[PDB]
Design a protein around this ligand. Structure first.
Ligand SMILES: COc1ccc2c(=O)n(C)c3c(C)nc(-c4ccccc4Cl)n3c2c1
Ligand SMILES: [Mg+2]
Ligand SMILES: [Zn+2]
Length: 313
């Protein structure tokens, strides 16, 4: 129990900041996650033997795709760590335990293709899960890894606490289905503005947790410009692979997914920042004021994309 993880001084300081980049050294990512669990949750939340075995089985079940990979998993968990650390007293012990694990697991076994491509392909998962196809798969994969011998990091919870944390993780993971974010955010916007938002109302907490999951999931738009810009290439490498597979089914893909229409990328990012990211971090900042640095970083990156269009880069 007296074994802390400790990071080098530069990481020890920068990890606390929303805009931290976890770096190109893969073998440090498990250590970074465990550090974040210890500071966010406690050195007791989990038996280190089981947590380490859980982390390595999760890593194994992320594939070698350009964006939806183990690095995304750890990045999204770090943004959740930054939110939880800046909002100390607003979250239960069970929520802090659940949300870091949900973030690490949220895209388990992703192949780099959207729910739409699975449906048009007629992939068997599209028959098993009619909506939120990949997200219901990611939750299924999370439960499977939890049930491997030696992997049940929640085994020391009471029966009811166990049902509650698995229910936090399921809603958290389903909420990363971007098609569900638009309605979730409108509802939170109305509740905030009419004054009826109530964090002791579980249905409202669920909604606020869903928005946090979206905010963490999108956190590549909230880094320093060079990280944001170089991550956008990984994102587009999957989009264009999906675009190619669409053309193989005899369907012209949307221009965002068409590698012939790379010119339209900067305008595509404008649309995405204005339609999705800016509104997401605005409502989040309204509900949880200390998450303002994510909105400020996102606006900065919006401005960097405007500069790309004006030929200034
Ligand atoms: C409608 O789906 C889009 C379109 C464009 C983007 C995009 O441009 N960015 C930056 C993005 C970022 C940073 N995470 C995502 C994303 C979120 C959930 C699921 C899959 C992805 Cl890929 N997206 C996007 C998603
Ligand atoms: Mg996902
Ligand atoms: Zn994701």
């Amino acid at each position: 129990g007296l074994m802390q993880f400790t990071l080098p001084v530069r990481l020890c300081k920068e990890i606390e900041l929303f805009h931290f980049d976890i770096g190109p050294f893969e073998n440090m990512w498990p250590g970074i996650f465990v550090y974040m669990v210890h500071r966010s949750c406690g050195t007791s939340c989990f038996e280190l033997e089981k947590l380490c075995r859980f982390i390595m089985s999760v890593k194994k079940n992320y594939r070698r795709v350009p964006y939806h990979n183990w690095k995304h998993a750890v990045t999204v968990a770090h943004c959740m760590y930054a939110i939880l650390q800046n909002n100390h007293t607003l979250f239960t012990d069970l929520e802090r335990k659940g949300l870091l694990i949900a973030c690490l697991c949220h895209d388990l076994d992703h192949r780099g293709f959207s729910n739409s491509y699975l449906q048009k392909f007629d992939h068997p998962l599209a028959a098993l899960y009619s909506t939120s196809t990949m997200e219901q798969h990611h939750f299924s994969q999370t439960v499977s890894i939890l049930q491997l011998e030696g992997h049940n990091i929640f085994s020391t919870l009471s029966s009811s606490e166990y049902e509650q944390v698995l229910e936090i993780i399921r809603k958290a993971i389903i909420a990363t289905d971007l098609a569900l974010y638009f309605g979730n955010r409108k509802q939170l916007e109305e509740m905030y503005q009419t004054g009826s938002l109530n964090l002791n109302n579980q249905s409202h907490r669920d909604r606020v947790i869903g928005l946090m999951m979206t905010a963490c999931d999108l956190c590549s738009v909230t880094k320093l410009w060079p990280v944001t810009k170089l991550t956008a290439n990984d994102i587009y490498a999957e989009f264009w692979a999906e675009g190619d597979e669409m053309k193989k089914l005899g369907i012209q893909p949307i221009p965002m997914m068409d590698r012939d229409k790379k010119d339209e990328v900067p305008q595509g990012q404008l649309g995405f920042y204005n339609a999705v990211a800016i509104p997401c971090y605005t409502t989040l900042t309204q509900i949880l004021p200390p998450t303002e640095p994510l909105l400020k970083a996102c606006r900065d990156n919006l401005s960097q994309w405007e500069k790309v269009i004006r030929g200034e880069e």
